[PDB]
Design a protein around this nucleic acid. Structure first.
Ligand SMILES: [Mg+2]
Lengths: 94, 126, 80, 105, 241, 97, 52
DNA sequence: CTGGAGAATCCCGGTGCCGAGGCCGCTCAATTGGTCGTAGACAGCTCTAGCACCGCTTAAACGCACGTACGCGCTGTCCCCCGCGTTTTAACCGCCAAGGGGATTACTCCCTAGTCTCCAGGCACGTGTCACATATATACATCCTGT
DNA sequence: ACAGGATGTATATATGTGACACGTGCCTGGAGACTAGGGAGTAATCCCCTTGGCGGTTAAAACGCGGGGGACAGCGCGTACGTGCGTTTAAGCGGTGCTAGAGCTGTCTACGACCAATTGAGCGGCCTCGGCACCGGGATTCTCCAG
């Protein structure tokens, strides 16, 4: 099937790591689904504009990292950058 | 307009609605079932005609008409109770060459249907 | 029609209670109704522009979410 | 054989997050590790928010994250309140706080 | 509602042995009247209205009722009623339905009552009951064919469950009842509006095609104009041109 | 009889409604107001039953947030009580003016 | 630790107690007679009069 | 400060409803494998700024001294919102039975748009300067503030 | 009910640090011929939701009505901020005078797109228990007069 895809399978996979026994209501799961579509578009739009700033025609991981630096308040940005860079580091070795 | 019509004729009455609160319903029924000097009780066929006792009156008038017989039968038998002391006449005002005739015809048809369907000796003897 | 009085004084007082207000002036209900009717008309006007453009006759919740994001006021929970 | 997402030690979808990138007219070239980075960041924010909301609800004697506690987790965090400053979580109400002036005694 | 205080009063008149609770009043009064009603035999017989059991049902469902009694059970015609569901989800060891007429208006009005009464006996649902009763419910105007062949078994099925005495021919100690119908006159202005309305283009169209409720609106506008006309339209002030 | 002093039931209303996340505007009247407002934009525009829900949530949040900024302007003038003067200052600073 | 079972006073009904409780309910019927009789509504007088 | 009533909260334990998750079964879409241009990266190299200094000039920042004007505080006065009980309007059913207005979806198809050329004006950066108006000068007009 | 005493304009003038004009060239529209894919124009399906409204009963508004305690006005006084004056600090407004590093150019892979398969998430679609939701105690907790 297809019709309407969403984040629900990843908001519940990531929730089962932080709190193995905690569930999530359909409304709250929908709210998380919506929230991720916010940050995705925000980071990707700032990254597209960043590519446009240094006149690149590609959004690389460097653009995404600089877009993450521009939005997260310090500690949030300092840990999100580490998450992204570790994921990219570990994905290039496989 | 019945409430207005009866004052034009000076008839002492009281009336019962879906809007009359419960304790007032009981008070009105008592101040008519057990009190004379009131001539007339104006009441709604559903809210007033469903299940309460009124032996203190007769001459039931059906000003309206409805194709569902249940309400009319139920309302008739508000007078025709155990504890009655006079024969109960039941008047029914039908406009001529007007659909009210057909409404009573439909009511009679459904009445006959019920007569057939459930009155066939569902007694304690069987 | 003029049904801006459906937002009644008790409702405005409940919205003030939720907002921490613990005493409300008398002329605060005829103010809040003018403040709320300007905010509604702005978000509805933008939701009807997103609905006319899609050649649709019903203002869907997506139109309201898009028009609310246009104002800056971002709400989470209706598919956007 | 192996989802691109799995090859990062993650739970989030590196594959679909690539398509959403190179379909939304952001640029003309999504790199090998642009979606691998964005997916990681998205999953990170989800981890943070979900943990906070989840045991805020479990602080409320609940075993099911409810949007009320989504709002509580977001509004109590100083970093997530800056991030989601202009976002209204529906059916999340507000935060309990009484101005000292109003309070009696 | 109207008979609530009658069941209380009659109780106190006939059986001054049981303790009675009569459940009516404003939102807070009904909370006050339930204080202590968890306790053993705090109340022996409880009276309440259909209409203020629907929005107070969380309190009643969580109780072991010995007998659940519905007066003028007529009020429970529909299975898709939402107070049929409210009363069905009541823990009751015995159920009793009182009504002057279990049905008059149509068949299938017995199935809701009997399924509420004996769920496991009448567990077979509307598909069975309609395929079973179709000749009888159609006999009036629609499907006839079987011509009251089914009536004997249908009637016999009810006999274990309902007692139906008729208070006219079985007890000759009762004043008589007369159906004194009286036909009523032309009523010139009533009839002017009647024959005008009944002949208008839109009413002709509606009577030709309509999604039920619009034609019921036609004949209910006729309730208006047949009963008295300021229901239909007040007589105009007449003034020189 | 017994009655609370002015300010006792007020803080109780504060506590009750600043803990329970639900709508506070009567549903049907607000849905009627939405149609009134939309009548002057495009005649005969249907509103999905969940579009008015989103509008109502986004309006109640806006009004609650505007009352939280009004109550600060009330306390700025040494006034525990809020009035049109405090809403106006709060909206002035918010850039809504 | 802060438990509240309220298993204390496990009161039960009995046949000897049945007739005693019926007796107090018969007295309650006798009291109901005071509800069955009636009194008046105590209507009120007209408003005070101006005199400038 | 304790009293003593009278209302509110506030967890404990109980009882069903129904959403949240459990699984199953195919559809979409992300992976795999491979050829084909190329994004940008990196290695020079031209050549603007940036930076860093130093002097002379003087506006300006700044400290001080002195009233005046404005700011927290008190209290009294009066009304207008809070609390709470009663009358009124809104608003659910049951009763009444389905059309139809309109999103949701495809299959054709013709029109619009990408792609990818080769020209040719027109937009940039010089250069060649012309000139608004900044700075300067003075009387005219308010525009004060102390008498 | 003034007048020193300041401060604020108003009008005029001039030349020099910025506003326009003119020529060039050369990257970029413009113009043109193919080739999809995209989107439009109908034609079918499935829903939901208005149909007109009515008369019972309820919760929520709405209204009466006391009264109390906060919103303001009045009064005062007691700092404290502007106002002005003398000093001095140090910025500005020009200069000289390196070389760090933009900005560019070129060159050439590693990188991105494509691209046909392939399959395995994933999403929909029912099912079935736990888990919140509401309830009904009784026991701690506040709030309100009362001494
Ligand atoms: Mg009865």
């Amino acid at each position: 099937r297809s019709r309407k895809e969403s984040y629900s399978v990843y908001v519940y996979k990531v929730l089962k790591q932080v709190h193995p026994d905690t569930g999530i209501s359909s409304k709250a799961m929908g709210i998380m689904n919506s929230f991720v579509n916010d940050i995705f578009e925000r980071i990707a739009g700032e990254a597209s504009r960043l590519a446009h700033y240094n006149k690149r025609s590609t959004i690389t991981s460097r653009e995404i990292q600089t877009a993450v630096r521009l939005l997260l308040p310090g500690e949030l940005a300092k840990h999100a950058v580490s998450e992204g860079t570790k994921a990219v580091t570990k994905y290039t070795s496989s | 307009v019945l409430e207005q019509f009866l004052t034009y004729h000076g008839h002492l009455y009281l009336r019962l609605d879906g809007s009359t609160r419960v304790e007032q319903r009981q008070a009105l029924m008592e101040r008519f079932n057990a009190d004379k000097r009131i001539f007339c009780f104006i009441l709604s066929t559903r809210s007033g005609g469903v299940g309460v006792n009124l032996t203190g009156a007769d001459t039931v008038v059906f000003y309206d008409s409805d194709w569902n017989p249940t309400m009319d039968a139920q309302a008739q038998d508000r007078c025709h109770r155990i504890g009655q002391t006079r024969d109960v006449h039941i008047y029914r005002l039908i406009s001529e060459r007007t659909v009210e005739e057909n409404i009573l015809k439909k009511a009679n048809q459904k009445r006959m249907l019920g007569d057939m369907a459930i009155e066939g000796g569902n007694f304690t003897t069987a | 029609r003029d049904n801006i009085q459906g937002i009644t004084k008790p409702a405005i007082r409940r919205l003030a209670r939720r907002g921490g207000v613990k005493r409300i002036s008398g002329l605060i209900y005829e103010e809040t109704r003018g403040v709320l009717k300007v905010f509604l008309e702005n978000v509805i006007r933008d939701a009807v522009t997103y609905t006319e453009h899609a050649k649709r006759k019903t203002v869907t919740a997506m139109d309201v979410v898009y028009a609310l994001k246009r104002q800056g006021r971002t709400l989470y929970g209706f598919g956007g | 054989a192996k989802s691109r997402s799995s090859r990062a030690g993650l739970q989030f979808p590196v594959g679909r997050v690539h398509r959403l990138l190179r379909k939304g007219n952001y640029a003309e070239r999504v790199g090998a590790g642009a979606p691998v980075y964005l997916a990681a960041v998205l999953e990170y924010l989800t981890a943070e928010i979900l943990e906070l909301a989840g045991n805020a609800a479990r602080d409320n004697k609940k075993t099911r994250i409810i949007p009320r506690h989504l709002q509580l987790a977001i509004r109590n965090d100083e970093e997530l309140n800056k991030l989601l400053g202009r976002v209204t979580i529906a059916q999340g109400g507000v935060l309990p706080n009484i101005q000292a002036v109003l309070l009696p005694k | 509602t109207s008979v609530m205080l009658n069941w209380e009063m009659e109780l106190k008149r006939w059986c001054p042995s049981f303790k009675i609770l009569t459940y009516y009043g404003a939102q807070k009064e009904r909370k006050l009247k339930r204080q202590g009603w968890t306790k053993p035999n705090a109340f022996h017989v409880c009276i309440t209205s259909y209409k203020l059991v629907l929005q107070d049902h969380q309190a009643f469902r969580r109780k072991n009722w010995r007998y659940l009694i519905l007066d003028e059970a007529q009020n429970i015609k529909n299975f898709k009623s939402q107070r049929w569901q409210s009363l069905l989800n009541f823990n009751s060891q015995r159920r009793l339905l009182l009504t002057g007429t279990p049905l008059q208006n149509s068949l299938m009005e017995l199935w809701s009552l009997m399924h509420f009464l004996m769920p496991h006996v009448f567990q077979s649902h509307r598909e069975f009951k309609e395929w079973f009763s179709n000749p009888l419910t159609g006999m009036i105007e629609g499907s006839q064919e079987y011509n009251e062949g089914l009536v004997k078994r249908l009637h016999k099925v009810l006999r274990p469950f309902l007692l139906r005495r008729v208070k006219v021919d079985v007890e000759k100690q009762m004043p008589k009842k007369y159906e004194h119908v009286i036909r009523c006159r032309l009523s010139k202005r009533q009839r002017c509006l009647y024959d005008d309305f009944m002949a208008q283009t839109t009413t002709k169209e509606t009577l030709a095609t309509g999604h039920f409720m619009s034609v019921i609106n036609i004949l209910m506008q006729l309730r208006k104009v047949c009963n008295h006309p300021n229901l239909f339209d007040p007589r105009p002030v007449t003034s020189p041109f | 009889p017994h009655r609370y002093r002015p300010g006792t039931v007020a803080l109780r209303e504060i506590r009750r409604y600043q803990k329970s996340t639900e709508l506070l505007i009567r549903k049907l009247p607000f849905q009627r107001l939405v149609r009134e407002i939309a009548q002057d934009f495009k005649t005969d525009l249907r509103f999905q039953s969940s579009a008015v829900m989103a509008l109502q949530e986004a309006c109640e949040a806006y009004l609650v947030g505007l009352f939280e900024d009004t109550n600060l302007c009330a306390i700025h003038a040494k006034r525990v009580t809020i009035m049109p003067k405090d809403i106006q200052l709060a909206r002035r600073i918010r850039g809504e003016r | 630790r802060r438990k509240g079972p309220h298993c204390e006073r496990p009161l039960t009904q009995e046949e000897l107690l049945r007739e005693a409780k019926i007796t107090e309910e018969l007295n309650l019927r006798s009291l109901e007679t005071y509800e069955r009789l009636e009194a008046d509504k105590k209507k009120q007088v007209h408003k005070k009069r101006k005199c400038p």
